[PDB]
Amino acid sequence: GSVQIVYKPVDLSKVTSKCGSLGNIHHKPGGGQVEVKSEKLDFKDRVQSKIGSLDNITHVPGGGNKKIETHKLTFRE
Amino acid sequence: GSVQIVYKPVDLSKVTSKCGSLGNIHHKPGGGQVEVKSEKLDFKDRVQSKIGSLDNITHVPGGGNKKIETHKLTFRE
Amino acid sequence: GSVQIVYKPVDLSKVTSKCGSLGNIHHKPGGGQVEVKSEKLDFKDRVQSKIGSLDNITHVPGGGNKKIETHKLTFRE
Amino acid sequence: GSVQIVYKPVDLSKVTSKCGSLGNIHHKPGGGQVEVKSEKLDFKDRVQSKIGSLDNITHVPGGGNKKIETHKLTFRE
Amino acid sequence: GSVQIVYKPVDLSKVTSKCGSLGNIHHKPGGGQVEVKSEKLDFKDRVQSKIGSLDNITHVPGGGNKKIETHKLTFRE
Amino acid sequence: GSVQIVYKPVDLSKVTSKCGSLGNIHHKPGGGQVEVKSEKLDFKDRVQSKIGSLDNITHVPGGGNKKIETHKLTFRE
Amino acid sequence: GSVQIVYKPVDLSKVTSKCGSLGNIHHKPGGGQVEVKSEKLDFKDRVQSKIGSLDNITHVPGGGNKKIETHKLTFRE
């Protein structure tokens, strides 16, 4: 009683982006006020806590393109 | 009772980005005020805590492109 | 009862970025005020804590492109 | 009952970035004020704590490109 | 035809201020951004021009009290 | 036709200020950004021009009190 | 036709300030950024021009008190 498994994922994908020009991009924030009053914090296992923040990203890629691919062959006899 | 497994992922992907020019990108923040009053913090295991922050990224790649790929063959007899 | 396993990941990927020019990129922050009052901190195991910060990245790569790939064949008889 | 395992990852990847010119990149921060009042800190095991910081990176690579690859064959009889 | 003029201003004024204590006075500004683009300026005769300014007075007198008094006898025959 | 003029300003004024204590006075500015682009400036006669300034006075007198008094007898026959 | 003029300003003024103590006065500025681009400047006659300045006075007198007094008898026959 043979088990024969044949995983053959072929992937000829493409992800592609032509641009002429990005040009004028002003990002001109006027100041903030933030206040946070915590007493106790217990974080445990897997955490990300951005607590009490005032911030400004200006993320201008020259085409940001992204491809994700997850293959998984679990087997249990 | 033979177990024959054949994992053959072929991947001819591409991720691609032409640009002419990025040009003018002003990022001109006006100042902040942040206040954070914590008493106790216990972090444990796996943490990232950006607590009480005032900050300014200007991330301008010449095309940022990204490809992720995770293969996994677990087997349990 | 033979176990025959054959992991053959072929990967002909590419990640690619042409640019003409990046040019003018002003990042001109006006000053901050940050205040943080913690009493106790116990970090343990795996931590990253940026506490009480005021900061300014200007990360301008000439195309930042990135490829991740994780293969894993666990086997338990 | 023979166990035959054959891990043959072939990887013909490429990560690539042409640029003409990066050119004008001003990073002109105006000063900060930061205050941090901690009493006790106990860090343990694996930590990174940037506490109470005011800072300015200007990271301008000539194309920063990065490839990660982790292979792992655990086996337990 | 005699002209007899008799100016007799008597002034027994007082201006007065008792205080116990002034005590805690925090003046904690978070930073600014100002931009001014003038081409031509011609000022003439009597001017005060504070142009393009970012500033912070903290004027804490121990009682500031002020008395003005202007007398004037013009005469034209 | 005699002209008899008698200017007799008597002035018994007082300006006065008792204080116990001035005590805590924090003046803690977070940094600025100022930009001024003028082409031509012609000032003439009587001018004061504070152009393009970023500044911080902390003027704490021990009672600042001030008295002004201007007398003037013009006469034209 | 005699002109008889008698200017008799009597002035028994006082300006006065008792204080116990001035005590804690922190003046803790965080740095600035100033930019000024002028082409031509012609000042003439009576000028004061503080152009392009970043500065910090901490003027703490032990009571600053001030009295001004201007007398003037012009006469034209």
Author numbering:
A (entry chain F), B (entry chain E), C (entry chain A), D (entry chain B), E (entry chain D), F (entry chain C), ...: 304 to 380
From the article:
Abundant filamentous amyloid inclusions that are made of all six brain tau isoforms are characteristic of ALS/PDC. We now show that tau filaments from Guam and Kii ALS/PDC adopt the CTE fold in brain and spinal cord. The greater heterogeneity of amyloid filaments, when compared to CTE and SSPE, probably reflects the fact that ALS/PDC is a multiple proteinopathy based on neuropathology, as suggested for cases from the Kii peninsula.
We analyzed extracts from temporal cortex of eight cases of ALS/PDC from the Kii peninsula. Cases 4 and 5 also contained tau-paired helical filaments (PHFs), like those from AD and other conditions. Besides tau filaments with the CTE fold, we also observed tau PHFs in three cases from the Kii peninsula and tau filaments with the CBD fold in one case. Besides AD, the Alzheimer tau fold also characterizes primary age-related tauopathy, familial British dementia, familial Danish dementia, and some prion protein amyloidoses.
